[PDB]
Design a protein around this ligand. Structure first.
Ligand SMILES: Cc1ncc(COP(=O)(O)O)c(/C=N/[C@@H](CO)C(=O)O)c1O
Ligand SMILES: Cc1ncc(COP(=O)(O)O)c(/C=N/[C@@H](CO)C(=O)O)c1O
Ligand SMILES: O=P(O)(O)OCCNS(=O)(=O)c1ccc(OC(F)(F)F)cc1
Ligand SMILES: O=P(O)(O)OCCNS(=O)(=O)c1ccc(OC(F)(F)F)cc1
Ligand SMILES: [Cl-]
Ligand SMILES: [Cl-]
Ligand SMILES: [Cl-]
Ligand SMILES: [Cl-]
Ligand SMILES: [Cl-]
Ligand SMILES: [Cl-]
Ligand SMILES: [Cl-]
Ligand SMILES: [Cl-]
Ligand SMILES: [Cl-]
Ligand SMILES: [Cl-]
Ligand SMILES: [Cl-]
Ligand SMILES: [Cl-]
Ligand SMILES: [Cl-]
Ligand SMILES: [Cl-]
Ligand SMILES: [Cl-]
Ligand SMILES: [Cl-]
Ligand SMILES: [Cl-]
Ligand SMILES: [Cl-]
Ligand SMILES: [Cl-]
Ligand SMILES: [Cl-]
Ligand SMILES: [Cl-]
Ligand SMILES: [Cl-]
Ligand SMILES: [Cl-]
Ligand SMILES: [Cl-]
Ligand SMILES: [Cl-]
Ligand SMILES: [Cl-]
Ligand SMILES: [Cs+]
Ligand SMILES: [Cs+]
Ligand SMILES: [Cs+]
Ligand SMILES: [Cs+]
Lengths: 394, 268, 394, 268
């Protein structure tokens, strides 16, 4: 029994051990209540404005589209406190944790961005925060781990399975299955069991709402398409949500193609994986032929979630949204291009969305199109990775 | 499922609880796992709960996490597990055999086909650890079509609707969860479960087996005294495997000793 | 002959070789013209809003002041594009360069923040950018150097003198003295010869203007004091300017005390140096007894300018502003405190201002005071430095 | 300043331009620098321009940057420089001695006291490289009080007001800058300066010496032919020091050779 539909079409659900069902039901109730509560909404708005820095800019990028009929704006989630869009929904979830009388936070992270956001919000709002991170990721993300610890969070390396994000996801759910009476699990993407896909969308939807208002002010019309990278699906669904009912507006999600789809070394389950049931949901998965869960490969650490949120699988199925992929090399070219032509250093995750917009422009340069790319994060964190690649090249 | 009905009727006659060990199939290898399972039976196991190695066992604590890892290190696949299950049934005609699955392994090549394979090899029940009763319909339907008992979890946080649902939909046995959290011998259940046991009987549920954190004889006896039909032990059994990897013969001796003691504690 | 007074009291002036006087006069004229030009102002406002992300938040920090009668807000220049306040005036100066028909930019940098800001603005606005940086600083600031190069700037290591910021300052002026017909020198602080102290203040003053509007909205009154770190003086004077005529409002500048004033290893020339003439101005200097110019020492890379802007020396002289110092250890404690209690990682420079506010609160916890700290930058860049210190300690 | 008036009157009589080398005092050490300066004089230098080592010589290119660094490596201080200047004057009664200063060294212990020390040691002129005419008042006043000629820069970018100011305020000589940029032999001045030379004469300025990038005899002759009273050479002289650090004797021989050639080119 739930208040809201746990499915988007065939996708989604609540595939958790029975012990966790009361926690999901409790969370769902608290959310539905919070969304009707002006006090909750006011506190959330205050944090987003005065602490996180919303609204974020919408930047017109004139140089990169010169000599084509593409007008490209970037939604600047890179300018949000924490340097990524993850901050938005962490603040909302931390307030739900408080609403429920929970005093502790559990979070998973792969790249570390969600972990940092969870740690910062927990510090601000007086919650005790524990973050699970695959042991391989802890090693790769020393800066983010240190940031989390500076902010008073406990970072717990996970050594089971492949010691990466999915294994961190498991550990968070094992902990929660034993601690839910006092702790909230602050899931970091629009995936997992209901009600998380719904909560994360609603707590990210200001991205698209602001974008719509900004584009109307600057251009007097809706965009032809909005384009966002898809790891688990949160930044994308936050950009897409407010436009779903605007049927003229294209919704393009970009999965990481890694070394190339044909290599198998990618992170594009929506278009190139197979539906399975894992991490509490029925959704497209990276998996073996036998049904073991596999990792997502990408140059970008944050596009490592080996499945995808169920609403994306649904929007794809009905043809409302279209999903594409961008390879490591394409993303790296987009990264360099934005740096040199617009003076913005984008996250490598976000660089996948930008790469697809550049392809839309370059393939058809005489097509009139008004595009928005969601710039989900800043790329300060990626300059070592890029350094090392360009060193190993030219 | 009929094997459970027959077992429980017989145990009622011998005024005994059931003692049911869990192991991971193919831990620490196929051949040793077959010997382990035969030792458990010979030593007095009344039924078996058997895990198919899965990449992401999110209801399991470290002991069973490591059992899955050992089996993968040995290259164990679900297909090999089904081969094992066929052989185990060919050896032992009446012992109930229950599998502990995760949903993706059941859904992977089609739910119906999964339960048809279980029926073909002679499995009696399937517990899907990450499918709550709310999501259970296609699983329990396929199970019943293939004469497999769907095993439902009755958590200590159960309300009346849940008790009625588990009583109605389940067959074979009702899994009475000792406590919240994940599998593990290091955490003992600190909750009286008598009331749940009584309500399940009221609603004509499948007989209850208590599981999670059962690692000692006194816990087996406690389960029976509270009105449960028996008790399941996993991590304690697997720890004996883990403790004795270097010594296969000693492993079996210790398994025999442990299972014998645990079975003896089931006498009312 | 100039349009504006080149001095603040006894301090300031135009102490450059004669060859550079026409360039300063040209720059002064272009500025005075630009400040009367609505088109210039509109273009500047557009860049600040839509590219840099202004206005920045003013965050109330409840946790850090609990149990005292201090209310503390942070002006969030850490959220500006580039992660520091330097972006504001770089955009204005780049527009002046264009106004003058200059096509090239020269900049100095020590920590690299001004260099990155110069590189980003030059990329956006199509100017060819060359940055001088002392060879010692290039070595210490590999990340920032790489960011500058990614954005298409030429970074030129300076090996003369002490191979640090002052030596970079010299090299920029030597280059300009030969290239001024085509290149603009984008000085990075409120110091140097007139008209730079004036231009940099006016192109940073939105910090204080926004702060005043924000504090009036939230509190209904002006702050009791506004507090900012002082390296060369730009973030501080940008915070102070709009409050100078509000005589009730304290203006507190915080110089780096390094290992302690008494050690001589500090960067606090305003209160502990000696007036001299160098880098085009008459101002307090770090210098030997013989009059050779010395370096500023601080744990924080950006508080390395060995003098101070002339307007600060003037505001001190007349008693309008008060200047204090904060040691490395004080700044490090403030850094850790903000991270853990407010979920904000501050630049170590900015941490000096925060440290002095914490001292104001802690010394007199029953004093009712409404304080604003200018949070001049984010501290992502400093986590390695902090890591290494805390490793060498506990 | 009277030494310059006397020199220029004498050179007018010998129909010669002045040849004026620059060196950094104490480069590469005090003793060698004294020998260098005596060699320049013996070889035909008409006047000297002498730099006091400064930490931040922002009007100097790399050649003279390195001369300052050498002198600092030798531990040379301004006090030692003033000791040197006293000795140089004690050796050579009539040669004009001009210093090339940066403002902070003049301002450090008081402007007046600086010029009083110059007068005490027998300096004839001071050029402060980072003080434009606009800022010059306290410097030129102190200079004149102490019988020191204030040397002003006439840049090629000079307008009429600047020419009139430099003509009025200056004494000794007017420094005619060959070009924009900083000191250095690697950059030759590509601008005809005759018009500036004529205007300065019109306004009764101190006689003009051309400087910046003068490294060859033809440039000395060109300066004289254009109407200048002479020419200053710095980087070319200092490069001979730099080239010959390892060989003090050869250093002096090459300095002598160079200065002799450059002085010979000043004959009209
Ligand atoms: C800057 C940025 N953009 C996009 C994404 C992609 O995530 P969605 O699809 O927007 O949910 C991420 C993800 N990071 C996660 C997983 O490693 C994490 O930090 O834990 C990110 O850090
Ligand atoms: C984040 C931050 N806050 C304050 C200051 C201090 O400079 P003002 O006093 O505000 O002008 C700096 C300085 N940085 C210079 C010098 O190294 C530079 O980057 O080149 C800074 O980077
Ligand atoms: O003795 P322990 O503590 O190791 O417990 C033994 C567990 N083995 S099992 O197959 O019964 C078993 C039963 C239920 C499980 O998860 C669920 F409850 F969510 F469904 C997991 C394993
Ligand atoms: O021959 P070069 O090119 O080395 O030039 C020699 C320079 N030596 S100097 O003392 O006359 C001299 C004169 C003026 C200077 O700067 C100023 F013009 F800004 F004032 C610097 C040095
Ligand atoms: Cl519903
Ligand atoms: Cl459904
Ligand atoms: Cl609990
Ligand atoms: Cl808006
Ligand atoms: Cl609206
Ligand atoms: Cl419009
Ligand atoms: Cl498909
Ligand atoms: Cl990955
Ligand atoms: Cl396309
Ligand atoms: Cl279109
Ligand atoms: Cl199968
Ligand atoms: Cl039943
Ligand atoms: Cl025992
Ligand atoms: Cl004026
Ligand atoms: Cl004055
Ligand atoms: Cl020029
Ligand atoms: Cl405002
Ligand atoms: Cl107003
Ligand atoms: Cl108010
Ligand atoms: Cl003083
Ligand atoms: Cl320093
Ligand atoms: Cl104080
Ligand atoms: Cl006060
Ligand atoms: Cl002196
Ligand atoms: Cl005269
Ligand atoms: Cl020669
Ligand atoms: Cs365009
Ligand atoms: Cs994906
Ligand atoms: Cs307070
Ligand atoms: Cs200072």
């Amino acid at each position: 029994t739930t208040l809201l539909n746990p499915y988007f079409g065939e996708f989604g659900g609540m595939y958790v051990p029975q012990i966790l069902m009361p926690a999901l039901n409790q969370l769902e109730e608290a959310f539905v209540s919070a969304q009707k509560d002006p006090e909750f909404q006011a506190q959330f708005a205050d944090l987003l404005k005065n602490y996180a820095g919303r609204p974020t800019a919408l930047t017109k990028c004139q140089n990169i589209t010169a000599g084509t009929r593409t007008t490209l704006y970037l939604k600047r989630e890179d300018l949000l406190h924490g340097g990524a869009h993850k901050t938005n929904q962490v603040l909302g979830q931390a307030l739900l944790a408080k609403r429920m009388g929970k005093s502790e936070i559990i979070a998973e992270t792969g790249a570390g961005a969600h972990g940092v956001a969870s740690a910062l919000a927990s510090a601000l709002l007086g919650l005790k925060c524990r973050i699970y991170m695959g042991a391989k990721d802890v090693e790769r993300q020393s800066p983010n781990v240190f940031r989390m610890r500076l902010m008073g969070a406990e970072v717990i390396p996970v050594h089971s399975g492949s010691a990466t994000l999915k294994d961190a996801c498991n550990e968070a759910l094992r902990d929660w299955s034993g601690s839910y009476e006092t702790a909230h699990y602050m899931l970091g993407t629009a995936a997992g069991p209901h009600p998380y896909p719904t909560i994360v969308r609603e707590f990210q939807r200001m991205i698209g709402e602001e974008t719509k208002a900004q584009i109307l002010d600057k251009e007097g019309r809706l965009p032809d398409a909005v384009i966002a990278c898809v790891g688990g699906g949160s930044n994308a669904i936050g950009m897409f949500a407010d436009f779903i009912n605007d049927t003229s507006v294209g919704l393009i999600g970009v999965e990481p193609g890694g070394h190339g789809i044909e290599t198998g070394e990618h992170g594009a389950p929506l278009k190139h994986g197979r539906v399975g049931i894992y991490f509490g949901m029925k959704a497209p998965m990276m998996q073996t032929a036998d049904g073991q869960i596999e990792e997502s490969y990408s140059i970008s650490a944050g596009l490592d979630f080996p499945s995808v949120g169920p609403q994306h699988a649904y929007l794809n199925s009905i043809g409302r949204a279209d999903y594409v992929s961008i390879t490591d090399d394409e993303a790296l070219e987009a990264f360099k291009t934005l740096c040199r032509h617009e003076g913005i250093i984008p996250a490598l995750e976000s660089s996948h969305a930008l790469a697809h917009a550049l392809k839309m422009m370059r393939e058809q340069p005489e097509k009139e199109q008004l595009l928005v790319v969601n710039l989900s994060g800043r790329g300060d964190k990626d300059i070592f990775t890029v350094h090392d690649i360009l060193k190993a090249r030219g | 499922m009929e094997r459970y009905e027959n077992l429980f009727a017989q145990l009622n006659d011998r005024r005994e609880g059931a003692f049911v060990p869990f192991v991971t199939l193919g831990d620490p290898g196929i051949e040793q796992s077959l010997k382990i399972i035969d030792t458990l039976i010979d030593a007095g196991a009344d039924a078996l709960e058997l895990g198919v190695p899965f990449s992401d066992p999110l209801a399991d604590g470290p002991t069973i996490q490591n059992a899955n890892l050992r089996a993968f290190a040995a290259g164990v696949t679900p297909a090999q597990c089904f081969e094992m299950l066929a052989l185990i049934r060919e050896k032992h005609p009446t012992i109930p055999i229950g599998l502990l699955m995760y949903a993706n392994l059941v859904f992977n090549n089609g739910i119906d086909a999964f339960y048809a394979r279980c029926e073909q090899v002679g499995v009696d029940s399937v517990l899907v650890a990450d499918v709550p009763v709310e999501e259970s319909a296609p699983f329990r339907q396929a199970a019943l079509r293939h004469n497999i008992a769907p095993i439902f979890i009755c958590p200590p946080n159960a309300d009346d609707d849940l008790l009625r649902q588990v009583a109605s939909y389940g067959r074979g046995y009702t899994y009475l969860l000792s406590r919240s959290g994940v599998t593990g011998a290091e955490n003992r259940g600190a909750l009286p479960l008598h009331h749940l046991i009584e309500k399940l009987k009221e609603y004509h549920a499948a007989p209850a087996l208590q599981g999670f954190g059962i690692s000692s004889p006194e816990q087996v006896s406690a389960a029976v005294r509270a009105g449960a039909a028996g008790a399941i032990s996993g991590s304690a059994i697997v720890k004996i495997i883990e403790k004795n990897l270097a010594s296969p013969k000693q492993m079996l001796a210790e398994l025999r000793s442990f299972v014998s003691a645990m079975k003896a504690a089931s006498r009312a």
